[PDB]
């Protein structure tokens, strides 16, 4: 079954079940490994995040930015394998509220608890075009701990325009087209 949504809200994410085609617009963030751990230590500390997480939209990816003008074009934009995160997504998710992920390979079928109790959904991107992912990305809004983590692992604040197809691999329902 196909969508395409703009604010993925949580009523949104519990329609949704395994093997559907998701197209995204609107607002989503970049976070692999090191900025999931940054992001867990700095609110475990009781700090504020430069950005707002709550019921957003991840992006397990690791683009290339290149400044065009004084502003930030995306070059390249491809799903990184979400395992990598499998150690963190659950407190990830505890600590933030967010509605989604999007990344490749899936993730442990143990966050399925997670997804149905806080309700996310996490949704398979198209590997192997990374280049080509990144006309989906209609604007940069911004980026954060560039500095200390370099482009790739910093978290990049992104408007994108029909990304997709992104299919359902785990939903909110106990359900993950890998297991
Ligand atoms: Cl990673």
Same mark, same amino acid.
């Given at each position: 079954? %196909?969508?395409? #949504?703009? /604010? =993925? &809200?949580?009523?949104?994410?519990?329609?949704? *079940?395994? @093997?559907?085609?998701?197209? +995204?617009?609107?607002?989503?963030?970049?976070?692999?490994?090191?900025?999931?751990?940054?992001?867990?230590?700095?609110?475990?500390?009781?700090?504020?995040?430069?950005?707002?997480?709550?019921?957003?939209?991840?992006?397990?990816?690791?683009?290339?930015?290149?400044?065009?003008?004084?502003?930030?074009?995306?070059?390249?934009?491809?799903?990184?394998?979400?395992?990598?995160?499998?150690?963190? %997504?659950?407190? #990830?998710? /505890? =600590? &933030?509220?967010?509605?989604?992920?999007?990344? *490749?390979? @899936?993730?442990?079928?143990? +966050?399925?608890?997670?997804?149905?109790?806080?309700?996310?959904?996490?949704?398979?991107?198209?590997?192997?075009?990374?280049?080509?992912?990144?006309?989906?990305?209609?604007?940069?809004?911004?980026?954060?701990?560039?500095?200390?983590?370099?482009?790739?692992?910093?978290?990049?604040?992104?408007?994108?325009?029909?990304?997709?197809?992104?299919?359902?691999?785990?939903?909110?329902?106990?359900?993950?087209?890998?297991?």
């Amino acid at each position: 079954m %196909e969508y395409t #949504f703009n /604010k =993925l &809200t949580k009523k949104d994410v519990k329609k949704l *079940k395994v @093997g559907d085609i998701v197209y +995204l617009n609107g607002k989503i963030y970049t976070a692999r490994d090191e900025a999931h751990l940054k992001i867990i230590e700095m609110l475990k500390s009781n700090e504020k995040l430069p950005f707002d997480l709550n019921e957003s939209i991840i992006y397990h990816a690791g683009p290339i930015m290149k400044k065009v003008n004084d502003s930030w074009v995306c070059v390249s934009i491809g799903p990184t394998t979400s395992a990598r995160m499998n150690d963190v %997504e659950e407190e #990830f998710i /505890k =600590l &933030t509220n967010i509605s989604a992920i999007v990344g *490749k390979g @899936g993730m442990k079928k143990e +966050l399925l608890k997670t997804f149905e109790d806080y309700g996310v959904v996490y949704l398979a991107a198209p590997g192997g075009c990374a280049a080509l992912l990144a006309n989906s990305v209609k604007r940069v809004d911004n980026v954060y701990f560039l500095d200390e983590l370099g482009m790739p692992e910093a978290v990049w604040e992104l408007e994108v325009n029909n990304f997709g197809p992104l299919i359902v691999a785990m939903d909110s329902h106990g359900n993950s087209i890998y297991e």
